[PDB]
């Protein structure tokens, strides 16, 4: 006598919020941006190729100085490249070989890396000796992790496959706050430039927004049919993109709380592996698992260019903090810096 | 090139030397994925060939190292983490079973990896286990051998 009434209340709430959303959907981004001059054909060449890995590359991350990038792989080796010179700075061996993601502290002091072992171990780069030692092992996640990101040298936000994101404290090693709003597994994270909100792409085709201090779902976005496999904030911090298996990017907005514009092409019938914006929020690089990534436009869905220098699919990609270049870790154990 | 940059290059070269040594050491290993119902003697046959996270088993048979990753430890959704195990020589199956077989037989990422099927109680190979584990290990080693033949022939362009 209670389930039916609450379910009907939830249905009514969904209907009224969807009507409120549709109320301000009078305009579309395409006709707004039809007047502005398109960028045109963009040619991005593989400036450098970092080799030394011997297995599929699952993730990478640039440092804040945008010169060092740490890349993980199946062989259980964590490598801190020097993008400018393509010479190693460190080569950290991992306890397990199933690392799905890496990270990088904003100060550059600490490095994190996690995977199927349900641990996001934080490494201590600048120690008194010349070897990188594990500094902590954050346990408490029921399932596997997929993205742990560093707020600062002392706060890290994880995102595990047990439908749960947590905010840990490094010295204590325990989660101060827990974010339990998702139903499916979580596959992405993007800390906002002001480091106050983040959006995680779940398996239920819904991406939620949270508050790092409160611990509640501020907003919730739908519009996909398959699991969301990528997430990337707009440089201003008011928009984010969603990459899903349905071969279609989807730009959202925090203030509007609605889809803003779609990115679809029929010739691509393969899913999305990772999405990364540019410095100015104009080019939406999206890496599909059809063995080549391509460059889009954030305003008029113009497939400006394609990065097709990779033997296998592009798994993870990222952009520098100064916008000078992008890199694409692929499944042939190659990192390529495109500029 | 200053002294500091040259010494950094030398350190990087030592790093590549160590990485290449480890890669050559670990290339001779072969990875296998254990997948099945979980209560049909999977641990039994695992201990037969033996003589949080995912259970890992290691053993050598004949100048070749086998790594056997048991997945029964984790009961999460099978499809979501299947993207990590896309590159594996073979999957050993020990006999919802029919649905699991149908799902794994037409996986998009498993269109090249063969499936090894065991009856205790891409090409698919089958064998009926006996008391002597030597026959079963011979069968699995042979099947991995044909998998390696196929991979090498594809690489060289003949296949």
């Amino acid at each position, epitope marked *: 006598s209670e389930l039916d009434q609450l379910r009907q209340e939830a249905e009514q709430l969904k209907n009224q919020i969807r009507d409120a959303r549709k109320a301000c959907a009078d305009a579309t981004l395409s006709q707004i941006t039809n007047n502005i001059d398109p960028v045109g054909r963009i040619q991005m060449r593989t400036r450098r190729t970092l080799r030394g890995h011997l297995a599929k590359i699952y993730a990478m991350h640039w440092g804040t100085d945008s010169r060092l990038l740490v890349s993980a792989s199946q062989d259980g080796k964590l490598i801190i490249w020097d993008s400018y010179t393509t010479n190693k700075v460190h080569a950290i061996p991992l306890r397990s070989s199933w690392v799905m993601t890496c990270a990088y502290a904003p100060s550059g002091n600490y490095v994190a890396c996690g995977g199927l072992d349900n641990i996001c171990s934080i490494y201590n780069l600048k120690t008194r000796e010349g070897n990188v030692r594990v500094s902590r092992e954050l346990a408490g996640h029921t399932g596997y992790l997929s993205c742990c990101r560093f707020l600062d040298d002392n706060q890290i936000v994880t995102s595990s496959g047990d439908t749960t994101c947590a905010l840990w404290d490094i010295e204590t090693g325990q989660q101060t706050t827990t974010f339990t709003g998702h139903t499916g597994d979580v596959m992405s994270l993007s800390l906002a430039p002001d480091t106050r909100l983040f959006v995680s792409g779940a398996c239920d085709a819904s991406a939620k927004l949270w508050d790092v201090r409160e611990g509640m779902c501020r907003q919730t976005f739908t519009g996909h049919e398959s699991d969301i496999n990528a997430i990337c904030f707009f440089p201003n911090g008011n928009a984010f993109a969603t990459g899903s298996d349905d071969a279609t990017c989807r730009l959202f907005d925090l203030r509007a709380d609605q889809e803003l514009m779609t990115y679809s092409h029929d010739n691509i019938i393969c899913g999305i592996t990772s999405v990364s914006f540019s410095k100015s929020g104009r080019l939406l690089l999206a890496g599909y698992d059809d063995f080549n990534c391509n460059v889009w436009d954030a305003l008029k869905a113009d497939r400006a260019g394609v990065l097709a220098g990779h033997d296998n699919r592009v798994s993870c990609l990222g952009v520098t903090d100064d916008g000078m270049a992008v890199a694409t870790g692929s499944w042939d154990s190659f990192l390529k810096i495109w500029n | 090139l200053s*002294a*500091e940059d040259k010494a950094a290059v030398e350190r990087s070269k030592m790093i590549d030397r160590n990485l290449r040594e480890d890669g050559e050491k670990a290339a001779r290993e072969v990875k296998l994925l254990l997948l099945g119902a979980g209560e049909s003697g999977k641990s039994t046959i695992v201990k037969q060939m033996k003589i949080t996270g995912i259970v890992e088993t290691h053993f050598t048979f004949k100048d070749l190292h086998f790594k056997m990753f048991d997945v029964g430890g984790q009961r999460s959704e099978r499809k979501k983490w299947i993207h990590c195990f896309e590159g594996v020589t073979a999957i050993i199956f020990c006999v919802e079973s029919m649905k699991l077989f149908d799902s794994i037989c037409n996986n998009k990422w498993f269109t090249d990896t063969s499936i090894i099927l065991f009856l205790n109680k891409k090409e698919i190979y089958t064998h009926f286990t006996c008391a002597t584990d030597t026959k079963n290990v011979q069968f699995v080693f042979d099947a991995v051998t044909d998998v390696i033949i196929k991979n090498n022939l594809k690489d060289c362009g003949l296949f």
Partner: single-chain antibody, 233 residues
Framework: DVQLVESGGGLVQPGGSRKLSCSAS????????MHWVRQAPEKGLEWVAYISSGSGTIYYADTVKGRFTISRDDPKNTLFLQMTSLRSEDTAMYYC??????????????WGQGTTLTVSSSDIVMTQATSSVPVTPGESVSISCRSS???????????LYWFLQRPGQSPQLLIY???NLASGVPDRFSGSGSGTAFTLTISRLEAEDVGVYYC?????????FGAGTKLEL
């Protein structure tokens, strides 16, 4: 804690041969490079030798080339210096310094205690015109030393270092690459410069900062130090 204890020396006849066993107890040794810094009695520092990581690079000073050899024993964490034909000017104190090279590293971070050696009886040149600066605590003092050639490189960093040698103590690093600060030093120290004119500024003098300041270049070997400038209360 990090330590580098060396041994040997004490009395040598001219033309002889001795051995110094510099040991780093309980820390990484194969990753670090090592140099040999010899200090003539009541004189400044003078670079002697340097063996790289993996013994793939070995460099001697031009004044000891062919007479000195430097070797390392990684498994037992020892560093060796074989001297041949020990002349009269080789009597000095010999230190052991660690130096690890990578992007963002701080070479010459730690210095050994030093064992004296007694004998019975081109390159970048860097000058410190000032010798003694008697300054009471509390007021900033500027120490400057100039290089013959610009230490700046096409990379954009200048390889000039500053060391503080407290009386009766081994020198320690506090400024590497003319701008940065070594870990474990107060923020009051700060340096600057451009090309050839280098300066060091201390915010305020303490009781423990009294000592002698050295500056050394590191673009290419040999690495010439500078005549130390002493400051007193």
């Amino acid at each position: 804690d990090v330590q580098l204890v060396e041994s040997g020396g004490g009395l040598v006849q001219p033309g002889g041969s001795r051995k110094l066993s510099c040991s780093a107890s309980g820390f990484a040794f194969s990753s670090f490079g090592m140099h040999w810094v010899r200090q003539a009695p009541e004189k400044g520092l003078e670079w002697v030798a340097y063996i790289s990581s993996g013994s793939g690079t070995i460099y001697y000073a031009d004044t000891v080339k062919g007479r000195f050899t430097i070797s390392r024993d990684d498994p037992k964490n020892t560093l060796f210096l074989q001297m041949t034909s020990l002349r009269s000017e080789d009597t000095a104190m010999y230190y052991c310094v660690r130096s690890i090279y990578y992007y963002g590293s701080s070479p010459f971070d730690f210095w050994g205690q030093g064992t004296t050696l007694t004998v019975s009886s081109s390159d970048i040149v860097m000058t410190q015109a000032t010798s003694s600066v008697p300054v009471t605590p509390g007021e900033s003092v500027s120490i400057s030393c100039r290089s013959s050639k610009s230490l700046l490189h096409s990379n954009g960093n200048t390889y000039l270092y500053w060391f503080l040698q407290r009386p009766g103590q081994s020198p320690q690093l506090l400024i590497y690459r003319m701008s940065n600060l070594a870990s474990g030093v107060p923020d009051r120290f700060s340096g600057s410069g451009s090309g050839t004119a280098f300066t060091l500024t201390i915010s305020r003098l303490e009781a423990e900062d009294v000592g002698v300041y050295y500056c050394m270049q590191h673009l290419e070997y040999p690495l010439t130090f500078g005549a130390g400038t002493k400051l007193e209360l």
